[PDB]
Amino acid sequence: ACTKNAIAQTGFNKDKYFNGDVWYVTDYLDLEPDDVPKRYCAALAAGTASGKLKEALYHYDPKTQDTFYDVSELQVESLGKYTANFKKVDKNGNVKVAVTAGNYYTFTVMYADDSSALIHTCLHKGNKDLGDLYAVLNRNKDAAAGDKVKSAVSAATLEFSKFISTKENNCAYDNDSLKSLLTK
Q1: How far apart are CA 135 and CA 29, in angstroms?
Q2: In the record, what terms sit under GO molecular function?
């Protein structure tokens, strides 16, 4: 179940966030903690491709080694708040699972700057959802969360101390694949 109306960043700079580059998830928190593993790896690219707002996603479970990529088309609800479809793809963009009615996530950028961000997402698969999921993002895969995004976590009335770090999982990412997928 999702329960939060996440508030987007005041003055959110959409072209800076959606610039074609990669974001690494360094820390996460699901308000339904059992919905996701305690160890995980995730990253995304976000950009405009031929006029359309897109994201490319990567998930990796560093223990089970379950791996998947996705390509998403985002529609605008308000500044900083989006509804995204997704298709499951291999790392090269070939479709494994097509865009499907009812398979979507919401995406809210609560905070962003040059190097970091805080997002909220509520994933839906049919009548199932994966809970309220917060993620601290960084442009550098190995950077510890700085005071700007940690203060943003507090300003959302969360505690950064309760987030789970991804940093000890030997996460290895394919940035070329993510940037290419934005076009698929």
Answers
A1: 7
A2: histamine binding; metal ion binding; nitric oxide binding; oxidoreductase activity
